[PDB]
Write a protein that binds this ligand. Structure first.
Ligand SMILES: [Zn+2]
Ligand SMILES: [Zn+2]
Ligand SMILES: [Zn+2]
Length: 178
């Protein structure tokens, strides 16, 4: 196994996958690392198994069809993994916890949103369709763009949104276009 957490790249108390070399902190893995389960398989492995069981799941899809899917177990897992892929980027720190807004010339967003809120919402099964999860994720970055305006800090929202979007297209096998 690896000697650092796959998500945050730090050592510490790690849980090791039994079917690949990755390791995780307890609350870095999504879902949080399961109490027992021997052997234990991480989310990367669980996602790889879905693909292997249904190879045609990698054929191209339309985003509109994906967003309307109900959050059955496999869609729940894919949203978990997509959220995890965002936390894997160190720039996710800016978007993890509950923000506050007091900048001369700007007003805070009507609907604040942050990664740990989306994490909670997933854990509590609050999304009935994929669309709920993707809307809240895209709202994080949109709120950041609107608030920071012409400050160059706006770029952090662009950067982390790009990671989100690339991974959304990968995980849900969105049809490639020009
Ligand atoms: Zn970690
Ligand atoms: Zn694994
Ligand atoms: Zn099949």
């Amino acid at each position: 196994n690896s000697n650092i957490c796959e998500v945050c790249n730090k050592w510490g108390r790690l849980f090791c996958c039994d079917t690949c070399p990755r390791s995780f902190h307890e609350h870095c893995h999504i879902p949080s690392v399961e109490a027992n389960k021997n052997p234990w398989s991480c989310i990367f492995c669980r996602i790889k198994t879905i693909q292997e069981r249904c190879p045609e799941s990698q054929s191209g899809h339309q985003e509109s069809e994906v967003l309307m899917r109900q959050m059955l177990p496999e869609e729940q897992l894919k949203c978990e993994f997509l959220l995890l892929k965002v936390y894997c980027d160190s720039k996710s720190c800016f978007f993890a916890s509950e923000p506050y807004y007091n900048r001369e010339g700007s007003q805070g967003p009507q609907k604040p949103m942050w990664l740990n809120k989306v994490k909670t919402s997933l854990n509590e099964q609050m999304y009935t369709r994929v669309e709920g999860f993707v809307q809240d994720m895209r709202l994080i970055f949109h709120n950041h763009k609107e608030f920071y305006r012409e400050d160059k800090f706006t770029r952090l929202g662009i950067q982390v949104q790009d990671i989100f979007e690339k991974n959304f297209r990968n995980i849900f096998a969105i049809q490639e276009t020009s």
